[PDB]
Amino acid sequence: KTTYERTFVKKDAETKEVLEGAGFKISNSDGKFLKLTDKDGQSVSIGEGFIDVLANNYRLTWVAESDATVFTSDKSGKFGLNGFADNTTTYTAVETNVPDGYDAAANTDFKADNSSSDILDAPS
Amino acid sequence: TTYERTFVKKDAETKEVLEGAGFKISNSDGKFLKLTDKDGQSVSIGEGFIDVLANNYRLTWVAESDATVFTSDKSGKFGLNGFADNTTTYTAVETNVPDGYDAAANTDFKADNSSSDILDAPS
Amino acid sequence: TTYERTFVKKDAETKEVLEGAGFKISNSDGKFLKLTDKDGQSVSIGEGFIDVLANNYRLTWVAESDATVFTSDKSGKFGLNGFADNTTTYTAVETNVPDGYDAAANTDFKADNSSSDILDAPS
Amino acid sequence: TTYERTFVKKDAETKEVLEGAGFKISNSDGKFLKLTDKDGQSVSIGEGFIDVLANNYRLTWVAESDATVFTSDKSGKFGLNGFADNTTTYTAVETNVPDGYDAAANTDFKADNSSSDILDAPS
Ligand SMILES: [Zn+2]
Ligand SMILES: [Zn+2]
Ligand SMILES: [Zn+2]
Ligand SMILES: [Zn+2]
Ligand SMILES: [Zn+2]
Ligand SMILES: [Zn+2]
Ligand SMILES: [Zn+2]
Ligand SMILES: [Zn+2]
Ligand SMILES: [Zn+2]
C-alpha cells in the first residue's frame, strides 16, 4: 500500500551550516519509539542520512525508547526515512545524541507528510 | 509436566493475522519472562511459538529490560511451552507494535494450553 | 590477600538444589558488582562459583544495569573469590528467578570465606 | 583545532596508579560524553587515553545511560583529545569503582591540555 516519508536537515542555529552526526529518536504519543527491522524482524545497522526503508525492505515498529533506532544527520545534515504507514499522526523527533559544541535542539513535532524541514542546534 | 500458551495476533478490523508484533510476558511480581539455555545463557529466538521443551530451554523471571520478546510469525502466532504452573496469572504486554497499528490492550492469561486472539486496532 | 563467598540455592520446601537462579551483589552505596578482565573489559561468565583469582579478573562496583549476574549451577552453587574486604556488608539480590519459584529474600553477607543456603519458595 | 585532557587515577594512600577505574564525563546540561565513529555508531574503547583525532571519532553529548565509560589503564591514565571547547566546565564522575576503593569525589575540569591526578581512598 501507499506510504509516506519525512526528511530533516540539521543546522547550526547561528551560521545555518549543516551539521553531521546529530542523532535522533522518533516517538509517538504512546511514548514508544521507532525501530527499523529487516523482513525477518531482526535489528539492522543503519548509518547516517535518509534511510530508504522501501528499497531495503525494512519494517517500522514502535518500541521502548532503549530499543529504538537512532537516526543521524549525514554530511549534508540530512536524516529521515520513507515507509511510514500514516501521514496524519503526530510524531516527535528527539535529539538523543548531540554534537560536541552544540546544545540539543528543541523537540520537533512533525507528521510524515513527505516534506523536508530544518532542525537548529544552538552553539554552546 | 508443563503447560503451554499460544496467541494469534490479528488486525481488529479485518481479522487478518499480523506478523511482527512483539510481546513480553510479566508476572504479578513485576518480573518478565526470559528464556535461557541449560547453562543460563541468553538465546536468540525468532518469531512464532517457542518449543522450550524440545530445545531444553529454561524459563526465568527477570527485569523488564532483560526480558525475552516473543513475536507473531507469518500465521500471527506466538507463545511457548514449558510453563511450570497453570494456575498463575500472567500478562502479555505488546512492547513492539507493527507500524500502522495501535498496541493491543494487555492480555491477562494462564498457561492453560489454550490458544486465543489478540487484536491490534489499525491506526 | 582476598576473600570469597559461596551460596547454595535451594527449594525452600524440598531443599533440592536449584540451578539457574541469577543474582546481583550490591554494596551500601547502591552499586553492584561487575567482573572485568585485566583490561577492564566485560567477561561472559557461566553458572557457578567464579574463580576470579585463577582467571585474573577484577571486581568493580557499577550501576545495577551494568552489573554481573551470578547464577546457581547444577549443584545450586554460586559465588566468587577475590573480594578485597571481609568486613563490608553486601547483599545478594535475586534478579533472575527460576520459573515455578518466588524470589528469595535479599541475603545480607560478608565476604568471610563461608558458604550458606538461599531458599526459593515454590510459587 | 581541538583540546585534550588526561587524568591519572591513584591510590590516595600509596599514590600507586590504579587500573580499571571507570569514569563518565558530564557537561552542565546534565548530558554525558559519548564517542561515536564517523557514521554515528558506538565504538568499543579500552582503557587509557583515547586518541579521538587519530581514530576519526566524534564527541557527542547524550543521556547518562548511553555514555562512554573511560577507564584508567596500567599507568592509571585515561582521557581523550578532540574536545571542541577549552573554556567549558566538565565533570569526571567515577561510575565504576575498583574493589577495595571508595569512589573519588567528582572532578571538575576544562579541556585545557593538562594532566592531573584523581585519588581513590582505600575502603
Ligand atoms: Zn496511538
Ligand atoms: Zn490485566
Ligand atoms: Zn488509533
Ligand atoms: Zn529433582
Ligand atoms: Zn552447572
Ligand atoms: Zn560504523
Ligand atoms: Zn562507600
Ligand atoms: Zn562542582
Ligand atoms: Zn601525581
Numbering used by the authors:
A (entry chain C): 175 to 298
B (entry chain A), C (entry chain B), D (entry chain D): 176 to 298
Question: What do the study authors state?
Answer:
As with other Gram-positive bacteria, sortase-dependent piliation in L. rhamnosus GG (called SpaCBA) is assembled from the ~30 kDa SpaA (backbone), ~20 kDa SpaB (basal), and ~90 kDa SpaC (tip-located) pilins. Two immunoglobulin (Ig)-like subdomains comprise GG-SpaA, each having the conserved residues of a canonical E-box motif and internal isopeptide bonds formed between either lysine and asparagine or lysine and aspartate residues.
As an alternative, GG-SpaA protein was fragmented by limited proteolysis as had been done previously for other backbone pilins. This produced a 15 kDa-sized fragment that can be crystallized in two different forms. Intriguingly, six metal ions are associated with the C-domain when the structure was solved using orthorhombic crystals. Mainly owing to the crystals having been grown in the presence of 20 mM zinc sulphate, these metal ions were modeled putatively as zinc. Metal ions are primarily coordinated by aspartates, but glutamate, lysine, and water from asymmetric and symmetric molecules also seem to participate. Among known categories of zinc-binding sites in proteins, the metal ion coordination environment in GG-SpaA can be classified as an “interface type”, based on the incomplete coordination spheres, weak electron densities for the coordinated water molecules, and the location of the metal sites.
